Ligand binder design. Sequence first.
Ligand SMILES: C/C=C1/[C@@H](O[C@@H]2O[C@H](CO)[C@@H](O)[C@H](O)[C@H]2O)N2[C@H]3C[C@@]45c6ccccc6N[C@@H]4[C@@H]2C[C@@H]1[C@@H]3[C@H]5OC(C)=O
Ligand SMILES: C/C=C1/[C@@H](O[C@@H]2O[C@H](CO)[C@@H](O)[C@H](O)[C@H]2O)N2[C@H]3C[C@@]45c6ccccc6N[C@@H]4[C@@H]2C[C@@H]1[C@@H]3[C@H]5OC(C)=O
Ligand SMILES: C/C=C1/[C@@H](O[C@@H]2O[C@H](CO)[C@@H](O)[C@H](O)[C@H]2O)N2[C@H]3C[C@@]45c6ccccc6N[C@@H]4[C@@H]2C[C@@H]1[C@@H]3[C@H]5OC(C)=O
Ligand SMILES: [Cl-]
Ligand SMILES: [Cl-]
Ligand SMILES: [Cl-]
Lengths: 471, 471, 471
Amino acid sequence: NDATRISRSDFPADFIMGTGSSAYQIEGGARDGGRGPSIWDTFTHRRPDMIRGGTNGDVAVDSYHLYKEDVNILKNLGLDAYRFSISWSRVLPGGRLSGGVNKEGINYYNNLIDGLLANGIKPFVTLFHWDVPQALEDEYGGFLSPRIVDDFCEYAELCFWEFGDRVKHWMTLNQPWTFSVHGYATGLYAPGRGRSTGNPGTEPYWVTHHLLLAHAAAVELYKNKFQRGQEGQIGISHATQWMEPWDENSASDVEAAARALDFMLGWFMEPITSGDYPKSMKKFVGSRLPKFSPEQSKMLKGSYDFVGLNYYTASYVTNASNFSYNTDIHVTYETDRNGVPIGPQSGSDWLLIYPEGIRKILVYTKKTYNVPLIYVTENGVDDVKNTNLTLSEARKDSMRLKYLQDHIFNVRQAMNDGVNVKGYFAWSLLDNFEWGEGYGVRFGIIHIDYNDNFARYPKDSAVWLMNSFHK
Amino acid sequence: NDATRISRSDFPADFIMGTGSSAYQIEGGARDGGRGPSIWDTFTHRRPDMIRGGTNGDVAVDSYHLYKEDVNILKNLGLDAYRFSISWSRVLPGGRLSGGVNKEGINYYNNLIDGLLANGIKPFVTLFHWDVPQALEDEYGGFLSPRIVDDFCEYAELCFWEFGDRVKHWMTLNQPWTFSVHGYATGLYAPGRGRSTGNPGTEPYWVTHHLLLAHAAAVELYKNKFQRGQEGQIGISHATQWMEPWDENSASDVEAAARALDFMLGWFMEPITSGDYPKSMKKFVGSRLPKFSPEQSKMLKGSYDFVGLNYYTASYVTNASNFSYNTDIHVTYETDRNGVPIGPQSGSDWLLIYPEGIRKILVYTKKTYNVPLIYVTENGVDDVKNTNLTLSEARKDSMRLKYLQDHIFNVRQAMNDGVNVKGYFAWSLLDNFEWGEGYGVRFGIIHIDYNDNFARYPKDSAVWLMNSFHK
Amino acid sequence: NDATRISRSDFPADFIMGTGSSAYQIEGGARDGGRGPSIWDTFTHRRPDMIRGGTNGDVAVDSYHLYKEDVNILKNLGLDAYRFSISWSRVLPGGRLSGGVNKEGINYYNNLIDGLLANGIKPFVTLFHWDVPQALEDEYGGFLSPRIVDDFCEYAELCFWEFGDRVKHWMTLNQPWTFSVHGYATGLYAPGRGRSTGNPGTEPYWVTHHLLLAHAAAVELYKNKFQRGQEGQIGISHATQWMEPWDENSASDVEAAARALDFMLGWFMEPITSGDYPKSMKKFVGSRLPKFSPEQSKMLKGSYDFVGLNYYTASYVTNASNFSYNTDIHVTYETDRNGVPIGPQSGSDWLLIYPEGIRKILVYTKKTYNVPLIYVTENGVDDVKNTNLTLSEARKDSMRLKYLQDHIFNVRQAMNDGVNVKGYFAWSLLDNFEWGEGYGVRFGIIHIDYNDNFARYPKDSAVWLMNSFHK
Ligand SMILES: C/C=C1/[C@@H](O[C@@H]2O[C@H](CO)[C@@H](O)[C@H](O)[C@H]2O)N2[C@H]3C[C@@]45c6ccccc6N[C@@H]4[C@@H]2C[C@@H]1[C@@H]3[C@H]5OC(C)=O
Ligand SMILES: C/C=C1/[C@@H](O[C@@H]2O[C@H](CO)[C@@H](O)[C@H](O)[C@H]2O)N2[C@H]3C[C@@]45c6ccccc6N[C@@H]4[C@@H]2C[C@@H]1[C@@H]3[C@H]5OC(C)=O
Ligand SMILES: C/C=C1/[C@@H](O[C@@H]2O[C@H](CO)[C@@H](O)[C@H](O)[C@H]2O)N2[C@H]3C[C@@]45c6ccccc6N[C@@H]4[C@@H]2C[C@@H]1[C@@H]3[C@H]5OC(C)=O
Ligand SMILES: [Cl-]
Ligand SMILES: [Cl-]
Ligand SMILES: [Cl-]
């Protein structure tokens, strides 16, 4: 009943604790070991103006060469599991089979997986984290085109065949919302489209449409071809953010909030639930929103063994007043009620600390979509920016410590409220590359010294997690 | 006066003898050492139907790993010089600087060059042999676009900076005719365009236009920035084929032949000579043929320290009767006069043995364009196809031996006729990848055993060259 | 008579062209191969707020590991010489001998030296570039104490003994002025005092007194114990800036200008010329200025075989209105003569381009001090800050190119004017750590890519120096 005392014994024996990362944010080795370029290589190299400080992830924090050390950090940490993604163009440098299979890349992921297991850490592997192979992008528009479904399936298949004997927990995509929206609506993330040159009214909906089909075809492939031999499970992971009615009463705000949810989580959750987009979306986007063949619907319906959700912050929503995903939602976001922000800021101004959000979003998801099995796949906060601190100052991440305590507590509540959560993954393991943000933002429970070969050192949060949750 | 007795002492002391190869036909290592894909990787991988036997050059004859052996073969051979090209996307895997500089690729060419020199073999290095980096191709149409001129100059510059201290003889392009015509007119060679989807009426002329400008900008860059410090020379190399009037008399055939020349050699030779295309071409292509700014003309005019010519065969020409380079020439080719072929066939049916052609084409070039310094940069013939021979049978390449004797003799004549030829390079050093032909065609003075790790063994021609020309 | 046309052939054949670095700005491996810490390690680690970005030289541009590449670059560059310094605490981790002699550090410098010589590049070696061993700083305050003279001698003897057989050009100190002024008057550089806590009125005078004694004691040691067997030369390297009277007419301004030169350059040049400090400094500093015993003056007088000057920029000077070196000078610095800036800005607002300054500083030194033999040991300029350019754009360094042209031109002038100038070193070879300014300011003629392992690429200036000055 007091969050600072929360610990492993407040959870069922089989509950899974872990941490995570994605390939491009940590691996480096961009051009080592036969890896091909991804759209994020091109984006950061051709448009350095789009990145704080003009940096990229050629080297990142060099987990590609330092992975034996990360594994050792994970062993000392004590948690059950580690979540990471595979770099598509490291194993298939030309994206599709005819561009060559990269043995060295396969060999890297085998080494990582063997190391995790030799140490009793269970791997959760995500197939895709926005790093589309540049060659598929240049050949046919990547996820714009539906050719991407077949290529994606060849890739998924390669992975199950090589790693499936050991990896028993797969996810097809992570955060597809973010890919679709900032890739094609705002143009702020690779491939940087839409303000032809792009179109925020249309492309985001095709891209999301192709994402979902790719997800579904891969899940079917796994279920029909691998599941019986390998006995693992497959799932997917979604961006979420709690939507709160600016005015508790105005049932017009209650609507705005519920619409904001549809356009973020329903956009992906409805189709794998009933095989169709949500009415709210069909209503306000109308004919710009693609439809599913009925065999497509039949294939998307129930396409998952579990769902993971990533949660960070929350917002107030109210109603609003050529075409564009953003304007299509017809909402405005507010941060305060009468001068009071929904929660304090972290180091980042888009991130307001609101622990109750995670309990809500979890309950809302079980209620609205009826998922039988959930993982919190990402959750965390960033240090305040300050290049002026020596290590012993830098590593005292009180705010992060409290932020994890509070959110893990709320996860525990949601379980009492009947939501079946099988685990929680803190984000992230290492300070790393943060996309448009470059290296200026630190999300890690492990500190990275950029001045001295990416030296790893544990923050207080890390030690707290090991002590409270070791096993 | 008898070709079988020809030897080194029939030539001036400073005359250069050598052999040659191009990167994609011999290196293999397609995806080793950080190399990026070129349009020839994509072509052979995505359209295996365009290649005899569906093969490609991933491994080729693996000079990339076996180069110490090739060097040893070259030392035993005894000739002065070795000509080879650099694979653009081995040193710049993304084509342009922002895609990364590949140290390992640079390191390979340094090793090759140091080895040649440690053995007293002079290297002649060609910058470009049709292997356009796929990334420039996908980003802006490669040589279709004029963006290719700047990228090409960055590439040229990289090479001069890294290798220019040792490499004193450069050529910008080899056989640009073949690239332009079969790349964009017939669609038989990468990138496989033109029967949008291509256009044999227009693209070949833009591509040739961009080739020439790339050539000129690089030569200027070398002359103004490197030549004084490094003291080497730069040049270029052209496809040629002797054109003969079907009827010695019909001054209408005399015209057809001269027009056939313009459209093959004049197309490239006129612009670096006077800074403009030949009238014949301007007449029959008219407004589909691009023009040169006058500063462009001024830059192309005299853009070379020497010219090399590649010669293989000859043809009879007579006059002929939507748009297309082929039909634009208004000629027909014939192989016989009254049932008599212009010369016997080799293993290939497009190759008719006509030694006098090389004397003619050489004299014609000095006469018509006034080149002060010429190298024969390619010349050779192929074995008859026969998988039925054991090595000791296979290596007896009489036809090649005689073919080299006869052509080297005619080169010697042309020199008496006042043409200033400084050297001759037999083609090629190794049996290797022959483009649309795959591995079924053998042009080497060194035999390659495809069944046993690409084992090198000298044919009789090789031993003949060593004995007749050693020094 | 045009700077842009200046080239090697405008200079005597024995004239020497090169480039330069100092150990802490490029080495890294700060705790590799046995190296102990200098006052710069401690300063950047304990007071990161004093460095832009809070960065440090732990890895810098990693010449400790990449020196073979650096040597290859120096080779391709084709200049005669390379100026670098030795890290005192890398060969003696504890500063004094009883602290241990580090074989592995010694072995690094030998490998550097041999690699230079194998490529025909002559090494010019500076013993001290501000990196005082932290052990000596802590034991007795480093250059505050006269104990530093003995230790510095032991350090110099070691280098003479180990490297003297191959190194024929030595310098004891580089820019002692900067060390004394910003270490002890402003407190902006290590060890950061003056801004007990330090005394800007007394320490800089003591530090400077000890720097001069250490310089003389080491020169004496070289001359009496090594010069005969090793046959090399030894001098020292001073910071200069051209001081121009705000009002050409005001004889009061002419004096401010002469006094500014006194307090900057005469401070160090007079003692080695006549064995005492300049009259104006005695006058304005008075009893706070230490005295030389008569036998120290005998040791200082004429204690050099040559002198190097570092030139960057210029200023206008006028008169001024507890104690501080800064106020002692009693002058005021002006940049504008009526909104007419003495010269345009480079990337740094302290640096105003004024090529004639170098001519005057040179002539002024020959006349005022009578130096027989002079090298320009440093001269160069920084790129405009810009993390938005891709590499093809970044490497286009016209301003640095013109800056070198004009300054080199002016060096030629000074030689017509009678100044015996034996060589000129461009500063610097590489973008590298720039003290208080961190990695934000680029001075190299070789670009460094901080995002991808400090990948090296030549800027236009580098290509230009190779071409114009190769030999
Ligand atoms: C719902 C979770 C998210 C998180 O997404 C996470 O961010 C982490 C920290 O960077 C990364 O480590 C992870 O890779 C990622 O999962 N971040 C934050 C900050 C975002 C942002 C702001 C402005 C422009 C683009 C942006 N994409 C960022 C992504 C998507 C989303 C928000 C998004 O919120 C907004 C304002 O839309
Ligand atoms: C003037 C010299 C040439 C030679 O070009 C050489 O061929 C050698 C052997 O393969 C290679 O080793 C070399 O890389 C190349 O320089 N070959 C031959 C056979 C060609 C051919 C025929 C049919 C389709 C495409 C083709 N391109 C082939 C190229 C260009 C040209 C002819 C060309 O003649 C014709 C009919 O146009
Ligand atoms: C006379 C030559 C110099 C140059 O010194 C050079 O700078 C290069 C580029 O950074 C370095 O790579 C070289 O190692 C260094 O010798 N820089 C400049 C800019 C300085 C500066 C300004 C503010 C605080 C400390 C400072 N020390 C810097 C040093 C000493 C001096 C000036 C100095 O200008 C002033 C106001 O005195
Ligand atoms: Cl395929
Ligand atoms: Cl670029
Ligand atoms: Cl001692």
